[PDB]
Design a protein around this ligand. Structure first.
Ligand code: FAD
Ligand code: FAD
Ligand code: ITR
Ligand code: ITR
Ligand code: DTR
Lengths: 339, 339
């Protein structure tokens, strides 16, 4: 059948692939196309630091932790393959610093080697007073996008640089099912006051001697302003902002300065990191991820729509779960058609 | 008094500095010079991977462990300073893989976060079956040499490219006290059948996505013969050879191939690492480090000599301890002179 994936960010691409991988033998003509107004390096995904780490507290939608876990495993499993880095993946170990004692993350056991930092360790960071240590993964957006793309491409999924106007339009196109993976911009296709830009700017700097991530946490200053540093495949991400509702898409000087000053403070060696770029992107914020089926009817047209958006600042971290999920629904959609 | 340090590797330089740092104030006319036939990038030190980690086997002498510990601390203490990386220092976390259960290292508590790997972790490198995980430091030779050098230089220590032919000789120059830090070549100045070249060749490769060290152990094949990988400040060290008695100083193709093949197995992603260089060096092997005073008399000449050599494959790892030690003796030498 006719399937159209709207979006070419981590979400759509995975999902496209995932659906395609799982039902191309179960269905001869299984046409997949991907429509997107932006492709890497242009998506939000392309800006993401890429570290796998959910949020401190358990998700309102309890199922989401499983998605996080499944993602971590699919990733871990590729650790050992000669392709992992080509896939934009590698293990990274690091610190979560806090200014006071804090309960253990629900994912404490999903990552490798979770443990509370000792005082000697804490002295490596004179500001913080409590924290954790653990090993995890880095799944770099831009790279993963390129991989997913090559994979899809070989599987014959076709891409089109298009701005979808209305689901109707697509549907009118011929779409049988439509997978909505439009991230923060999902609103335009259908309003959702729940969804919102969680803006973040970051500085990319060249500072190879930094081998571990350090993610600082402020307790009376929202989730993002604290400075954070995340070593990636080829550069380091200096970070520190999460402004909900800001739609400004240009990097701002003060943000640049606060990020720079904050990190330089947490890691004085940055005093010599060469800055290689700055970026800003919109985390698709929503209280809970929207991943559900929805029948849209336009006259005589019976087109199904599966939503998968609102992954906030953890899209990479949870991408695979949701993908598996959409697949399951896409299956039911297929089952209702008796295949 | 006139003091002459023979050697400009990690050992001499530290020692020079260290002595100078403590008695420049106290000792009246204090004149330190460093004589060496090789300077970075030419020393053995310049080839060292730079990871702090003593041998897995217990200390040969007691002092060796304290020296190791003192070194680790002096290093840790600079973690937080904005100079550390300029000093060639940074934390690095990593794995020690074994093919069977093995007792815990005596340094288990000197490093940060020592812990036994879990099975999931073990899965990352299938061939092994047991191992550890811990965080430590990297003190890169070439860089540390340059730092020590600048420091010494500012303190006014003078350097001379020269080949000492006999302690006597140098004694003749009016040298008051000589510090022998000639590494494997210490023999020539005075025979020591205990000392021997522990040859090691390594490939430097560009593979930034590798953030942690992995040090394999073949228990039958000896120490540092198994493949090992150690991410450094700007490149990665592929390693794997420790041939005692080999004085060949040219990189050998076979070695290059076994190193390359071994690491490529342990870490398949290396398939795409660009090789940036190969190097070979002589670990100054000796059953116990030689660090002791020795009066050499030549006619009417009463010149003291303090030896500090034979640090094997753990020179960086233990440099500071020994330095502090030589200092203490140099002090006694000064005390016997009533200052
Ligand atoms: C600064 C920052 C750091 C981050 N770091 C991390 C991290 O370390 N770990 C982690 O897991 N997550 C992180 N994230 C979150 C991650 O970036 C997002 O969760 C993820 O990128 C969301 O993916 P997406 O495909 O849903 O959105 P995007 O990647 O933005 O995908 C949007 C896609 O839909 C298209 N599109 C939308 N509407 C239409 C339309 N009407 N017609 C056509 N095409 C349309 C766009 O062209 C694009 O193809 C970070 C995000 C930011 C901003
Ligand atoms: C392949 C390899 C990997 C290593 N990795 C590590 C590691 O990861 N961690 C660690 O702690 N250690 C490591 N080591 C060990 C470390 O390299 C040595 O322990 C350390 O370099 C010894 O320092 P040194 O100054 O005593 O010898 P060198 O660095 O070789 O110093 C020799 C100096 O004395 C001079 N000299 C000698 N004789 C004379 C003379 N007659 N006249 C004038 N000058 C003279 C030479 O020019 C030079 O100045 C490694 C070594 C090798 C070979
Ligand atoms: N996910 C990241 C990195 C990050 C900063 N603070 C965090 C707290 C919990 C989990 C992740 C993070 C981002 O910049 O969006
Ligand atoms: N010191 C190193 C690295 C190394 C390889 N095997 C080891 C066992 C114990 C301690 C260190 C190592 C060197 O290459 O000399
Ligand atoms: N080299 C001789 C004597 C001398 C002067 N300064 C030092 C320092 C270290 C050893 C010897 C010397 C000279 O300068 O006449």
């Amino acid at each position: 059948m006719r399937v159209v994936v709207i979006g070419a960010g981590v979400i759509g691409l995975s999902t496209a692939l995932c659906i395609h991988e799982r039902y191309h033998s179960v269905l001869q003509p299984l046409d997949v196309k991907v429509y997107a107004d932006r492709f890497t390096p242009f998506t939000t995904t392309d800006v993401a630091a890429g570290l796998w780490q959910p949020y401190t507290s358990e998700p309102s939608n309890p199922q989401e932790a499983n998605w996080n876990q499944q993602t971590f495993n699919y990733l871990l499993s590729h650790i050992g393959s000669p392709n992992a880095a080509n896939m934009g993946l590698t293990p990274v170990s690091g610190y979560n610093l806090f200014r006071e004692a804090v309960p253990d993350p629900y994912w404490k056991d999903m990552v490798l080697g979770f443990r509370k930092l000792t005082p000697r360790e804490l002295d490596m960071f004179p500001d913080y007073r409590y924290g954790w240590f653990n090993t995890s993964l880095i799944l770099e957006g831009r790279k993963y996008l390129q991989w997913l793309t090559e994979r899809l491409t070989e599987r014959g999924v076709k891409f089109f640089l298009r701005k979808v106007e209305s689901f109707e339009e697509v549907a009118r196109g011929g779409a049988d099912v439509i997978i909505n993976c439009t991230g923060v911009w999902a609103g335009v296709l259908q309003p959702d006051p729940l969804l919102q830009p969680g803006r973040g700017q970051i500085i990319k700097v060249d500072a190879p001697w930094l081998k571990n991530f350090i993610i600082t946490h402020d307790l009376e200053r929202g989730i993002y302003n604290s400075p954070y540093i995340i070593p990636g495949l080829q550069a380091v991400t200096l970070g520190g902002t999460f402004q909900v509702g800001n739609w400004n898409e240009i990097n701002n000087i003060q943000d640049h300065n606060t990020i720079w000053e904050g990190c330089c403070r947490l890691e004085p060696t940055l005093k010599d990191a060469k800055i290689v770029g700055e970026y800003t992107g919109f985390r698709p914020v929503r209280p809970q991820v929207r991943l559900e089926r929805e029948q849209l009817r336009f006259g005589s047209s019976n087109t199904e729509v599966i939503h998968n958006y609102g992954h906030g600042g953890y899209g990479l971290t949870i991408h695979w779960g949701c993908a598996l999920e959409v697949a399951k629904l896409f299956g039911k959609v297929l089952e209702e058609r008796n295949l």
